[PDB]
């Protein structure tokens, strides 16, 4: 969609393969606050939005 009509995903009680998803996209910029991408790739979460 466009930016004002964004699609929201919420993940609970599941396992992810971030790398299979990370390798499908080509990153250009990131800016985290309170976490890092590596910590997102190596951690366990109550939820992911």
């Amino acid at each position: 969609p466009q930016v004002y009509n964004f699609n929201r995903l919420v993940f609970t009680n599941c396992n992810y393969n971030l790398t299979k998803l990370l390798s499908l996209f080509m990153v250009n910029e990131f800016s985290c606050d309170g976490i890092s991408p590596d910590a997102i790739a190596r951690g366990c979460y109550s939820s992911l939005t």
Binding site: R8, V10, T12, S47, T49
Partner: protein
């Protein structure tokens, strides 16, 4: 029975209480044995006495006790069919279903919304014989829930089958600081509302 939406306005004739877009419906069903969560687009049918017609006062849900709540079998689409008699269910995002046990206890139901969706709390989960509400459902509703409407239930009780029905109360949640008291078994039986008095 509830009707939670984001945009509200008048019907065609002019009576208030129409939802124009994806609307959340929390309809208990199965003679109090099932909860329906529907997130659908709601369409006033043009038939007589229905929300689209000129001769429309109010809509309501119901069920025929001797055919729906009969001993032989419990119909699980009674109130939902009575609802569909008034509205068309189009573009339904999801339809959930939650089982309910039959009893005459005093329960609590709460509902909130945040970034992660719509959250449903009930005392029936976790503390059935107490009064603490535990989360049991989360709904992928991410639009605002600006408005809600209590849907009038009406048991089709005939003169021989007429029965009394309990009233319920709806208390708004506020952004307040409390102080809680957890028992040894983890349940809360005592609190303090820090803004009430000195």
């Amino acid at each position: 029975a509830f009707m939670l939406g984001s945009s509200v306005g008048n019907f065609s004739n002019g009576v208030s209480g129409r939802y124009f877009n994806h609307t959340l419906l929390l309809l208990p069903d199965g003679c109090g044995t099932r909860l329906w969560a529907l997130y659908c687009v709601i369409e006033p049918r043009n038939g007589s006495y229905c929300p689209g017609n000129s001769n429309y006062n109010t809509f309501a849900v119901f069920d025929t006790p001797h055919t729906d709540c009969t001993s032989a079998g419990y119909n699980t689409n009674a109130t939902l069919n009575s609802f569909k008699e008034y509205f068309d269910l189009q573009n339904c995002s999801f339809i959930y279903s939650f089982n309910i046990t039959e009893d005459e206890n005093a329960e609590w139901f709460g509902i909130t919304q945040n970034t992660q969706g719509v959250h449903l709390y009930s005392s029936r989960k976790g503390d059935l014989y107490g009064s603490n509400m535990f989360l049991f459902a989360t709904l992928p509703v991410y639009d605002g829930i600006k408005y809600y409407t209590v849907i009038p239930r009406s048991i089709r009780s005939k003169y021989s089958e007429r029965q009394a029905w309990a009233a319920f109360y709806i208390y708004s949640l506020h952004k307040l600081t409390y102080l809680l008291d957890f028992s040894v078994d983890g349940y809360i039986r005592r609190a303090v509302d820090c803004g009430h008095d000195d």
